[PDB]
């Protein structure tokens, strides 16, 4: 019985608390989207907007929890970009081996980092360890794959550049998300093995049923999403 616009007014404060905590660029994108919902003629149009908010806000909060930079989708580097700038001596070979699979060059993960525009991180192993720790401590489904030429050992007398590819998400089928993600990147990982490039792929996901202390985002951010974007989804259906 409530019009979509009136739904947005009742949730004015929860959504103000949301926009205040998200990173700037992320906060603006959700704000634009929110006014699209408020001015949404249809329930279909509103629903797609709400979904995009759910994903954008969650990723902003994932950036905050890990102190990583939130990158709007438009600015996110592709795999080819990372290879070209981070491993320039191998980019030509990278092209030849992606002739039969050129979509590899256009793979765009949520986070594309390298060891200290590809973002930088102080240690890739530390990031993998904390994912592996919480997965083991709380039972949270992850998938994780490292490139490895032949059966090469790690070495102590030299340092090599390396990539960390990360995929995140806020959807109800958590196992389905990490399974599909790792399957998408498997060919790439195997490609990187044959080029001698060291990469790690991580993938994880939360849904609203996950206990508020066990998410990949801080619990304070869990309450912000549950109080705003998830209530909005409930209002949109019951009206």
């Amino acid at each position, epitope marked *: 019985k409530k019009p979509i616009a009136l739904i947005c007014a009742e949730l004015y404060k929860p959504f103000q608390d949301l926009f205040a905590a998200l990173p700037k660029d992320c906060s603006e994108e959700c704000q634009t989207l929110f006014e699209d919902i408020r001015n949404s003629e249809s329930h279909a149009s509103a629903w797609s907007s709400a979904l995009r908010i759910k994903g954008v806000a969650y990723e902003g909060f994932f950036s905050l929890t890990n102190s990583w930079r939130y990158i709007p989708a438009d600015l996110k580097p592709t795999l080819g970009m990372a290879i070209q700038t981070v491993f320039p001596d191998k980019f030509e070979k990278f092209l030849e081996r992606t002739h039969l699979h050129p979509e590899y060059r256009d793979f765009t993960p949520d986070y594309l980092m390298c060891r200290s525009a590809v973002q930088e991180v102080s240690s890739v192993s530390a990031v993998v360890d904390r994912f592996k720790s919480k997965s083991s401590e709380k039972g949270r489904p992850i998938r994780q794959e490292e490139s490895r030429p032949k059966t090469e*050992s790690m070495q102590e007398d030299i340092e090599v550049d390396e990539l960390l590819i990360v995929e995140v998400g806020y959807q109800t089928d958590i196992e389905g998300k990490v399974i599909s993600d790792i399957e998408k990147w498997k060919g790439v990982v195997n490609l990187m093995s044959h080029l*001698g490039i060291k990469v790690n792929v991580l993938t994880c996901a939360d849904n609203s049923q996950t206990p508020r202390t066990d998410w990949w985002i801080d619990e304070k951010y869990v309450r912000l999403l549950l109080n705003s974007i998830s209530y909005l989804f409930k209002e949109l259906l019951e009206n």
Partner: antibody, heavy 118, light 113 residues
Framework: EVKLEESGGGLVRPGGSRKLSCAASGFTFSSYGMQWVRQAPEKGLEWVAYISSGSRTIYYADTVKGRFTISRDNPKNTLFLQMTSLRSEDTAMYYC???????????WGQGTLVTVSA | QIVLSQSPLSLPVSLGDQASISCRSSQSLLHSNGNTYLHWYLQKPGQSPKLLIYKVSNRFSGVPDRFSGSGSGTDFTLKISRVEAEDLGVYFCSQSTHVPYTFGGGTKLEIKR
């Protein structure tokens, strides 16, 4: 002077268990990977296990997998090898080694003799 | 696993002569990071092994300079330019490019008399 001093050897019954230790001195132990190597009497060298400085990476010979655990206590400058379900084929002199900067065996201990027999 | 084939199995040599020991790898030991992790060890009778040469041709600190190594890919050699009594023992090659790290079976250096 870099020194590695193994202890823990002796006689064990087949199927039994044993824990080797290696006390390291003369270098910053916690910054370097550590290794175990063994030599059966009258035979050649055989690599056993490696462990990185921070313990994140561990490798095993296929013949000890599922039976041997390598570990370390960096504040105590000690490397360990926990041996279980031992067989007569595990009878050997056991050496701890380190590359002090690489994965080669630059520094070796005097070794400790493990005998698996009833 | 990398199989390392050493020849000859045993090497009789006169004091003062040179000696060459060959180590053949079943696969290339060139690691993707650019280094080649092939090393040489002497084990004297009764003692623990001693490193001689690391990454193909670097003499370990303190090792007498009559010892040297060369090679690339799957073919590598240890030379003792002038053999001395103390060089009696077994020489092993080993790689650490791939897991498992592996050793050759050992060449016994024998002093000719």
């Amino acid at each position: 002077e870099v020194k590695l001093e193994e202890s823990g050897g002796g006689l064990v019954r087949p199927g039994g268990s044993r824990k080797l230790s290696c006390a390291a001195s003369g270098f910053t132990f916690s910054s370097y990977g550590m290794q175990w190597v063994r030599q059966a009497p009258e035979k050649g060298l055989e690599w056993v296990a490696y462990i990185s400085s921070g313990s994140r990476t561990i490798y095993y010979a296929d013949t000890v997998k599922g039976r041997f655990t390598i570990s370390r206590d960096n504040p105590k400058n000690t490397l360990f090898l926990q041996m279980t379900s031992l067989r007569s084929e595990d009878t050997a002199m056991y050496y701890c080694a380190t590359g002090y900067g690489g994965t080669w065996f630059a520094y070796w201990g005097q070794g400790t003799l493990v005998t698996v027999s009833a | 696993q990398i199989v390392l084939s050493q020849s000859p199995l045993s090497l009789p040599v006169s004091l003062g002569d040179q000696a060459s020991i060959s180590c053949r790898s079943s696969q290339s030991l060139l690691h993707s990071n650019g280094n080649t992790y092939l090393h040489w060890y002497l084990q004297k009778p009764g003692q623990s092994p001693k490193l001689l040469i690391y990454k193909v041709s670097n003499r370990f600190s303190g090792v007498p300079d009559r010892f040297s190594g060369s090679g690339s890919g799957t073919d590598f050699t240890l030379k003792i330019s002038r053999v001395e009594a103390e060089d009696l023992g077994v020489y092993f090659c080993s790689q650490s490019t791939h897991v498992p790290y592996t050793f050759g079976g050992g060449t016994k250096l024998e002093i000719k008399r």
